[PDB]
Amino acid sequence: TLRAAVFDLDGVLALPAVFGVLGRTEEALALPRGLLNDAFQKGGPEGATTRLMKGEITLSQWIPLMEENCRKCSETAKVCLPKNFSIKEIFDKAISARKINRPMLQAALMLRKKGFTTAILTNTWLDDRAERDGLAQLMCELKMHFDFLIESCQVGMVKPEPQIYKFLLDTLKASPSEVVFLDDIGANLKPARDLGMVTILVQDTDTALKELEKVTGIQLLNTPAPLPTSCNPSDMSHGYVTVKPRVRLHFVELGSGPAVCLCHGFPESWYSWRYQIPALAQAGYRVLAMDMKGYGESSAPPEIEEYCMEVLCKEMVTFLDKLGLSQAVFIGHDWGGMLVWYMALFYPERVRAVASLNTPFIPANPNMSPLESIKANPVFDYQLYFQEPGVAEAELEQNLSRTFKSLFRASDESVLSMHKVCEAGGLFVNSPEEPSLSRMVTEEEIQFYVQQFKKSGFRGPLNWYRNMERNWKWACKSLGRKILIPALMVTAEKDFVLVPQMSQHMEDWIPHLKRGHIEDCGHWTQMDKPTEVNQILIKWLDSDAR
Amino acid sequence: TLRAAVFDLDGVLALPAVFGVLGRTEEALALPRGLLNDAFQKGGPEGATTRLMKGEITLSQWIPLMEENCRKCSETAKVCLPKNFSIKEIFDKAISARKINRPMLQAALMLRKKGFTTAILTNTWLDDRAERDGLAQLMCELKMHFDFLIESCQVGMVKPEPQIYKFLLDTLKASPSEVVFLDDIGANLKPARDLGMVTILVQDTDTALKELEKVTGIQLLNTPAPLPTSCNPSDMSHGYVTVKPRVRLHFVELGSGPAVCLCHGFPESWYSWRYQIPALAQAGYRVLAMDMKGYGESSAPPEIEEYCMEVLCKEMVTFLDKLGLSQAVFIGHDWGGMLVWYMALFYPERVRAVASLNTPFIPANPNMSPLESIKANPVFDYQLYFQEPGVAEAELEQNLSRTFKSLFRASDESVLSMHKVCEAGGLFVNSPEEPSLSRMVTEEEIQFYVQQFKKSGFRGPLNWYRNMERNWKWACKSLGRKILIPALMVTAEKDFVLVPQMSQHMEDWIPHLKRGHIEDCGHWTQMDKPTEVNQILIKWLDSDAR
Numbered sequence A, B: 001t002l003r004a005a006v007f008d009l010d011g012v013l014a015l016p017a018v019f020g021v022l023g024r025t026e027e028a029l030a031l032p033r034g035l036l037n038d039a040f041q042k043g044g045p046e047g048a049t050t051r052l053m054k055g056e057i058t059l060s061q062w063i064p065l066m067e068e069n070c071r072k073c074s075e076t077a078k079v080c081l082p083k084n085f086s087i088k089e090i091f092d093k094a095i096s097a098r099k100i101n102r103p104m105l106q107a108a109l110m111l112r113k114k115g116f117t118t119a120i121l122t123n124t125w126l127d128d129r130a131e132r133d134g135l136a137q138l139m140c141e142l143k144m145h146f147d148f149l150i151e152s153c154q155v156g157m158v159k160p161e162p163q164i165y166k167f168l169l170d171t172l173k174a175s176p177s178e179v180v181f182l183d184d185i186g187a188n189l190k191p192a193r194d195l196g197m198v199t200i201l202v203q204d205t206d207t208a209l210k211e212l213e214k215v216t217g218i219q220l221l222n223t224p225a226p227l228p229t230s231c232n233p234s235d236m237s238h239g240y241v242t243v244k245p246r247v248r249l250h251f252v253e254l255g256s257g258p259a260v261c262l263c264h265g266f267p268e269s270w271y272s273w274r275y276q277i278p279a280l281a282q283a284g285y286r287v288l289a290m291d292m293k294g295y296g297e298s299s300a301p302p303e304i305e306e307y308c309m310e311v312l313c314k315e316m317v318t319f320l321d322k323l324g325l326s327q328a329v330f331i332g333h334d335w336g337g338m339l340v341w342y343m344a345l346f347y348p349e350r351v352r353a354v355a356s357l358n359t360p361f362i363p364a365n366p367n368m369s370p371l372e373s374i375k376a377n378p379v380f381d382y383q384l385y386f387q388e389p390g391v392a393e394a395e396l397e398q399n400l401s402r403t404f405k406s407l408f409r410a411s412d413e414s415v416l417s418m419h420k421v422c423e424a425g426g427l428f429v430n431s432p433e434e435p436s437l438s439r440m441v442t443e444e445e446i447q448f449y450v451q452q453f454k455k456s457g458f459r460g461p462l463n464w465y466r467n468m469e470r471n472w473k474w475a476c477k478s479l480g481r482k483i484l485i486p487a488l489m490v491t492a493e494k495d496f497v498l499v500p501q502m503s504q505h506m507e508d509w510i511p512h513l514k515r516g517h518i519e520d521c522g523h524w525t526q527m528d529k530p531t532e533v534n535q536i537l538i539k540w541l542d543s544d545a546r
């Protein structure tokens, strides 16, 4: 019967609640118990705080009004306000003190995921303080997880006036006995209850959630750790840059701060970074997640040379130029890993910082051609299979669903063997027509890749593998050099192709290299261990790219 | 006969040249005359500086090599290097000391504009210093004005080796006697001369330009002050955000730094900011130049209400949300001016700073309906003409070329009279079929607007005018408030509709308002006085939005 969930902000989604700072200030400054709240509520519906909450005045017009109220309250109580008493000062501290209440948000997340219509209903103000950005951030981080945000100052009404609940029920397209409403102030529940809404006084979070769990019949507390926030492709800002006449580059863009350019692998998508894209934006970064040349909404010229490393790097630099970026942090995985390394080597001035997932920096062997090298490793066999234009395209484009369902697997979940692919005559010869969904990806996620590769298919992506000679000659020009910009390498325990030991010799070329390791991690790092990936990168960026 | 122009960087496009810092350091530190240059050149083609310039090593590998050379040079010269001697320190100072040489660049600009193939040919290095971004910036600002940039370290060759000139002539698709090459070091000219290229030793800039003027037969020196850099639409990064299911917003994006959101007027385009977009990017800003709802590549639903101020503002906030921006600076002109003001009023938390060109902040008259107000001013007549869905669309869409050629005029150049448009029965009744091109815009610029308005025409844009009642009711909710965030107002002397006196009362609502005035400026401010506009905004942003 419950179909909707409403959360107060202050005291429910954010802690500590600003009303409690009022008590601790009183206590701190040894003021009469409740003085600050008497002054705050002064005049009830005709008072300054209602005008604020109704949106009639801004937070800065309100500040001196509240000071007066404190004077009037302190006079009436026959005490003297302390020297250098400052309402601005106090509210600054208070507002910046509050953070998202993780357990509660995730509870709301869960409820939405099981299909509830969730909303924030809050009395709040038009904040014009020089420090308003802080609160602006919080509300941003919070609003993306809810169907609605109803702000007292935006709708001209306040809790606990009955009108706002009607507005709430209207906005929800629900009837009162279908909503649960959580709030920390009892007065505000009264009117929700009168309409027949389930209510919860939120004192301590956990108890509030136990009640919520009980009423909804969904497990909220003690539940498993949820995935990082993902991306709905159509809620994203999509960018397009022509880097030369044939060729356009597409990216997805989120956040502000230092520019971070995410470079996916074979055969993937900007979408392979769906778990990183929110995290880093939230961490303070401008994330530019590429469709690498040949993929998705990016161009895919058919010629092989269009995909050698030199051209691909030139084109990334041009990307920076047209977009006005003097530098960006480069982070790549798989093929994208290889490319960001060479970016560091040929264009240090344009690379703020470099990092790679799984892809070690391997230098060219001036003495042994890459064809020889690739033969020297059985696990590289599939690469020779990729050389003959047409063969791999045909196998891979034959059933897309099948292809990605088969590639995108966690460690325990392997259904292919990159071992003697050539001999076998294909990648899929002894793997299933209809592989099971891997635990890492949903049917919907797989279909996204499916719809993308329908645009250009595999020629472009496969071409990346077809310039072994050209890339080797090129790479050799950099044998003299060293990587001295900040650099992170991140290894995946259970990558059975990009094994962590391939990275062992990296400090020889990259003396200040920083490292990350991820246990129980296959080749598809971002979607296998998104929490860990986010943790390692954000930590790295904060110390090294700022 | 001359068809191409090549410019050295160090000493030609950038001053002071780093070789001269070497002399002044020597002089500063009382070292043997030339010691620093002996050490720099040490070993000629087998030396460290060649490897650097050839790209064999990075600038940071080079640094200690150069120190050794100084030791060896100082030993041989029987002097002791000073306590705390630091090549890094010296090159840091030097590189950061150099700036673009305005007269020279503009000379190159001019030559390109009269059809020359221009290029930079320079010996230079792979810079991995922690401070490489500085130089990265300079090269960015410089490379956008030239057909080619040939870097010694990128092509593996150096001036004055003859191979690089061959490469140069190849890249240019020119024969030697069609190029002029400017350089400050004589040795480098020698090989250009051997092939039969016109050359210029660049000592003082002005003399170099006099020779250049003489050889090319184009006036370079003493020439009129050129326009700010414009934008080629197809060299820009284009962004797309769906703000709700019907409706997508398109923007053009350039630069990094604080987010600046540019809001054009009626009936215009992101392209109306073409002169501001580079300037601000160069000034340190992330410029997001909108197609406002109803225009260009943005959506244009036909319903009027889709265009009231409230919806338009909601949708801008959503724009921020989906793009991950907690705030941005809002700058608008005309209708966009009106909108940024209301943004400040209803969403201060999301507005870092607000500024308007021509559009004063006028509050609603709670007592007099907007229809009455608009009748009270003869110069507003055209607005009543705009009310009847269909009438204005038909006149305006009938000849697009004609429409914009007629609207987009400088002050002296007026061909319409917004006076008694209704009575006359149209905007164009006694104006020409084929107006002359106004001095502000080229045929190509006008055609750009033409091709844009072909997409949705005038319904959307005109609809902005059709919510006088709705916007008035809405605006009234803010009668209690004040604008206390940083705010600039910029008036145009010769705006015969948005006259500067309409702004006189603004300090009553906006007490810290900052002001800008532009003399000899019509209504189409950005394209009328781009230099002034850029000057006022950049100055304002630097003090107020940072």
Ligand SMILES: O=C(N[C@H]1CC[C@H](Oc2ccc(C(=O)O)cc2)CC1)N[C@]12C[C@H]3C[C@H](C[C@H](C3)C1)C2
Binding pocket: A266, A267, A334, A335, A338, A359, A406, A407, A409, A410, A411, A413, A414, A415, A416, A418, A497, A522, A523
């Ligand atoms: O080949 C590269 N990635 C493969 C892409 C497909 C994937 O297939 C898998 C992966 C996992 C599984 C599973 O879990 O069963 C199955 C199939 C295997 C890895 N990356 C490079 C990166 C650089 C440059 C060049 C040479 C070398 C170094 C490898 C390409």
Ligand SMILES: O=C(N[C@H]1CC[C@H](Oc2ccc(C(=O)O)cc2)CC1)N[C@]12C[C@H]3C[C@H](C[C@H](C3)C1)C2
Binding pocket: B266, B267, B334, B335, B338, B359, B406, B407, B409, B410, B411, B413, B414, B415, B416, B418, B497, B522, B523
């Ligand atoms: O009408 C608005 N702009 C017009 C657009 C077209 C232009 O036509 C011109 C302009 C110049 C010339 C010339 O040089 O001959 C000819 C025609 C006249 C100005 N802007 C607003 C901005 C706010 C909100 C609302 C009401 C009021 C306050 C005016 C719209």
Ligand SMILES: [Mg+2]
Binding pocket: A008, A009, A010, A011, A012, A017, A183, A184, A185
């Ligand atoms: Mg509360």
Ligand SMILES: [Mg+2]
Binding pocket: B008, B009, B010, B011, B012, B017, B183, B184, B185
């Ligand atoms: Mg020079």
